[PDB]
Amino acid sequence: PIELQALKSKYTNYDHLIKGSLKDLNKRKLSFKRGKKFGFYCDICNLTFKDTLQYIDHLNHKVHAIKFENLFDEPLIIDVPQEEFELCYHNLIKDFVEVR
Amino acid sequence: NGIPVKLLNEAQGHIVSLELTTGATYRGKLVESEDSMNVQLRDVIATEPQGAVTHMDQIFVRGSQIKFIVVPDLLKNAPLFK
Amino acid sequence: ESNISPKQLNNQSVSLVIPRLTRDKIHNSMYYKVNLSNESLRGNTMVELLKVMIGAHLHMMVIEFKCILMKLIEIRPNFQQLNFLLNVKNENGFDSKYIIALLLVYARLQYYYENDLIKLFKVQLYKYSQHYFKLKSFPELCIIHIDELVDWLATQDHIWGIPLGKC
Amino acid sequence: NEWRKSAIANTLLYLRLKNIYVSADDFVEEQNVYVLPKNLLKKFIEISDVKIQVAAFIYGMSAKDHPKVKEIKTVVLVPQLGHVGSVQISNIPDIGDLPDTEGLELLGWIHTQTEELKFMAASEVATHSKLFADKKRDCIDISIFSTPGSVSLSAYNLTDEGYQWGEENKDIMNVLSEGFEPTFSTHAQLLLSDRITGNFIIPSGNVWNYTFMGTAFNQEGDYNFKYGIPLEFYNEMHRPVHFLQFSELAGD
Amino acid sequence: DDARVLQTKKENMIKNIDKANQVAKNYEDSEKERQKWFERQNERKQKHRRIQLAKQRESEEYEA
Amino acid sequence: YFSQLKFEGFALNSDIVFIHQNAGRLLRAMFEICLKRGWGHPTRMLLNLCKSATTKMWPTNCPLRQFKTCPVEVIKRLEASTVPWGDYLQLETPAEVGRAIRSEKYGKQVYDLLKRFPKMSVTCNAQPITRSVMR
RNA sequence: CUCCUCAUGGUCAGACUAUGUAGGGAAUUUUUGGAAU
């Protein structure tokens, strides 16, 4: 539900998703399915990947995007009649000043 | 306010059925539903406990007198699942 | 088919603007696979492509710039949109900060001589070269002035590894 | 290195006071002489480290038997970040608020080291000067040499030239330390007694050692103080980072 | 008043350590430009004068 | 066990179950023994250990953990904030507590729970009855 | 345990949400019965 929409908000913005490495160099004591309890978590297909290029590359793959869409909707596939850069770009300046 | 009050306000504009404390059933289009369950109804077909059926144009029944309502299934989707 | 190599921009292909080596360094780089292309941008989207760069002391130094520029190429938005994005939003000063040389090197790669509009874009970039701006750049670390990078860029053959033609 | 070996080595520190001796200097009434109790010293040794320098301030007042005698009643342990052979220390404490302070004068400060010197080193002299620059010229220092089996109390004074040297030369300055010499230092008169005792003052947060808290320590900054029992150099309160790293080892 | 000051300085200590902790989590002119383009443009006119001088030497070679 | 570590390999986890059941016992015994002996250094640390066996946490983990209603994000934030506990306890204004814990939400709850945490203004006046006896 | 009121801290342009030494949940639309036979 709403928590699933927050999960969406997570797997959408990568800047926060980019870092699962916050442990940096650390020792953690304990067929990719239902998670390995370690590695990189993909909840959409329920797979965890021990390396970064596999985690992001799988995300760039179609199947992971197909499952991500089948969860709810198809925003990933979603002209420019000048309102895109006028209104959207103006929202980039506005939101940029709001964050700054 | 009540969550079922919120649903019942969503039910406005649909065709609902109402059973009162007397047992008479009023089926029709719900115009208005107050917070107190007072409901305004249109083009009502009424079935009495004896089985006789009548037609009336505009009816308004008090909340307290309503046993229960049946509302269309469209509303079941959301947002009351949360 | 090597990479995507689609569309338009001087009658051959769009991705031919950048060498194979550096282009595959980017397409094999992390930043491209994470924050860009179809799954990140919901298909090709110029405004969300700008959401990525604008979203990126500042951490982003003029790898990420090579990549975002490359996706600007491959998407190839409208010259009109270039005009708006260049001249709008004067009520905020943090918006065009690193977007300047990005939209600049972009049109620097695009075409060499719509034509008159492109020339107006170039002379406006000359005005901004006179605007006296300062920025930092990395590969080593070198801070460079907009007047040096714009003039030295138009007069210079290679820029940060990518060759240029003469307009 | 790190916490494990030195912290485990800390338990044996009570053994270092079984034998206590100093090279006995001639006793002279001309200059003021200090009387230090055996318990405060012992507690300071316990809290201190085998390698890293631990240093507190020391306070007291002149007794009415001899005004020239200075009894050290109150040790004041202060915010600091220690290294091997060097330490960073906060300002002079403002302790007027506490009770049992009726004009307690600032006598000096005390510190630990492992090297046997007849003089004060650069890292020590510079720190001394930075503490007492314009504030008290005649304050003293207690340099405790510590090694397994015995400790040694080496007291020192300072002249007006050393303060200037410390003002000019703070960071590095090994050659100007070599030139500076041990000449400025003069061996102060210190005694160790069981006939009097004393107490500790500690910061309000009750963490005096900022070793692993690098962001929280401020070399000039205000702190509230209170009476209490000081903790070990490696103690659970001083090592919070380790627990998040310890549970973070298994993760989640 | 003294107690309020203690609570205050304490709040500032906590907040400052909080901003510092956030930092730890994150870790885990114009005349010189105009004169510069003047010397650079002078270098461009010097290069064009060098190419024109080379064409002059070639014209002298053709005349000889 | 003090740090709340459940384990995969369950041999260790069985041993730590044994330690779970008998640990607070043994520690509490040691504490009482030292208290009878009249020893100052061990008794305080042992009392902290006993508390840690009872409530399953360290000193460096904030005491807000042992509240049932205090949330997880807040306790993480305080653990990571590197702040003396006395300061948080001295804070009064609820909005000011929310600002101090840098999350605006839950601040009022936190302050309520603080006033539910033990806080003592304690004073003592000693005085001799005679030379040997001191009241 | 739940709903309201109030207080509150936060967020948004009155609403929403956590907490509370708080008040409350017998006089017409709900919980102190018009039911009983």
UniProtKB/Swiss-Prot annotation, chain A:
One GO CC annotation: U4/U6 x U5 tri-snRNP complex
Zn finger (C2H2-type) location: 40-64
Alphabetized UniProt keyword annotations: Metal-binding, mRNA processing, mRNA splicing, Nucleus, Repeat, Ribonucleoprotein, Spliceosome, Zinc, Zinc-finger
Primary site of residence: nucleus
Cellular compartment(s): Nucleus
GO biological process: mRNA splicing, via spliceosome
GO molecular function: zinc ion binding
Role this protein plays: Participates in pre-mRNA splicing. Part of the U4/U5/U6 tri-snRNP complex, one of the building blocks of the spliceosome.
Quaternary context: Component of the U4/U6-U5 tri-snRNP complex composed of the U4, U6 and U5 snRNAs and at least PRP3, PRP4, PRP6, PRP8, PRP18, PRP31, PRP38, SNU13, SNU23, SNU66, SNU114, SPP381, SMB1, SMD1, SMD2, SMD3, SMX2, SMX3, LSM2, LSM3, LSM4, LSM5, LSM6, LSM7, LSM8, BRR2 and DIB1.
More info: Present with 907 molecules/cell in log phase SD medium.
Designated name of the protein: 23 kDa U4/U6.U5 small nuclear ribonucleoprotein component
From Swiss-Prot, chain B:
Family: Belongs to the snRNP core protein family.
Gene name of the encoded protein: SMD3
Record's keyword terms, sorted: Cytoplasm, mRNA processing, mRNA splicing, Nucleus, Ribonucleoprotein, RNA-binding
Function: Plays a role in pre-mRNA splicing as a core component of the spliceosomal U1, U2, U4 and U5 small nuclear ribonucleoproteins (snRNPs), the building blocks of the spliceosome. Also binds telomerase RNA and is required for its accumulation.
Any one Gene Ontology cellular component term annotated for this protein: catalytic step 2 spliceosome
Name this polypeptide is given: Small nuclear ribonucleoprotein Sm D3
GO terms classed as biological process: 7-methylguanosine cap hypermethylation; mRNA 5'-splice site recognition; mRNA splicing, via spliceosome; spliceosomal complex assembly; spliceosomal snRNP assembly; U2-type prespliceosome assembly
Annotated compartments: Cytoplasm, Cytosol; Nucleus
Residues of the full protein shown: 4 to 85 of 101
Subunit structure as annotated in this protein's UniProt entry: Component of the Sm core complex, present in spliceosomal snRNP U1, U2, U4/U6 and U5. The core complex contains SMB1, SMD1, SMD2, SMD3, SME1, SMX3 and SMX2 (Sm proteins B, D1, D2, D3, E, F and G, respectively), and is probably a heptameric ring structure. SMD3 specifically interacts with SMB1.
Domain Sm: 3-75
Cysteine disulfide links: none
Keyword Ribonucleoprotein: yes
Keyword Nucleotide-binding part of the UniProt annotation: no
Native organism taxonomy: Eukaryota, Fungi, Dikarya, Ascomycota, Saccharomycotina
Molecular-function annotations in GO: mRNA binding; RNA binding
UniProtKB/Swiss-Prot annotation, chain D:
Domain MPN: from-to ranges: 33-162
Domain of life: Eukaryota
Compartment(s) of residence: Nucleus
Note: Present with 468 molecules/cell in log phase SD medium.
Recorded domain comment: The MPN (JAB/Mov34) domain has structural similarity with deubiquitinating enzymes, but lacks the residues that would bind the catalytic metal ion.
Description of how the protein assembles with itself and partners: Component of the U4/U6-U5 tri-snRNP complex composed of the U4, U6 and U5 snRNAs and at least PRP3, PRP4, PRP6, PRP8, PRP18, PRP31, PRP38, SNU13, SNU23, SNU66, SNU114, SPP381, SMB1, SMD1, SMD2, SMD3, SMX2, SMX3, LSM2, LSM3, LSM4, LSM5, LSM6, LSM7, LSM8, BRR2 and DIB1.
Protein's job: Functions as a scaffold that mediates the ordered assembly of spliceosomal proteins and snRNAs. Required for association of BRR2 with the spliceosomal U5 snRNP, and the subsequent assembly of the U4/U6-U5 tri-snRNP complex. Functions as a scaffold that positions spliceosomal U2, U5 and U6 snRNAs at splice sites on pre-mRNA substrates, so that splicing can occur. Interacts with both the 5' and the 3' splice site, as well as the branch region. Has a role in branch site-3' splice site selection. Associates with the branch site-3' splice 3'-exon region. Also has a role in cell cycle.
Protein name (database record): Pre-mRNA-splicing factor 8
Origin species: Saccharomyces cerevisiae (strain ATCC 204508 / S288c) (Baker's yeast)
Record gene name: PRP8
Range of the intact protein held here: 2150 to 2401 of 2413
Swiss-Prot record, chain F:
Effect of R28N: Abolishes unwinding of U4/U6 snRNA
Disulfide bonds: none
Subcellular location: Nucleus
Domain of life: Eukaryota
Domains as described in the record: Contains two helicase domains. The N-terminal helicase domain has catalytic activity by itself, contrary to the C-terminal helicase domain that may have a regulatory role and enhance the activity of the first helicase domain.
Function: RNA helicase that plays an essential role in pre-mRNA splicing as component of the U5 snRNP and U4/U6-U5 tri-snRNP complexes. Involved in spliceosome assembly, activation and disassembly. Mediates changes in the dynamic network of RNA-RNA interactions in the spliceosome. Catalyzes the ATP-dependent unwinding of U4/U6 RNA duplices, an essential step in the assembly of a catalytically active spliceosome.
Other comment: Present with 1440 molecules/cell in log phase SD medium.
Subunit and interaction comment: Component of the U4/U6-U5 tri-snRNP complex composed of the U4, U6 and U5 snRNAs and at least PRP3, PRP4, PRP6, PRP8, PRP18, PRP31, PRP38, SNU13, SNU23, SNU66, SNU114, SPP381, SMB1, SMD1, SMD2, SMD3, SMX2, SMX3, LSM2, LSM3, LSM4, LSM5, LSM6, LSM7, LSM8, BRR2 and DIB1. Interaction with PRP8 is important for recruitment to the U4/U6-U5 tri-snRNP complex.
Family: Belongs to the helicase family. SKI2 subfamily.
Name of the protein in its database record: Pre-mRNA-splicing helicase BRR2
Natural source organism: Saccharomyces cerevisiae (strain ATCC 204508 / S288c) (Baker's yeast)
Gene: BRR2
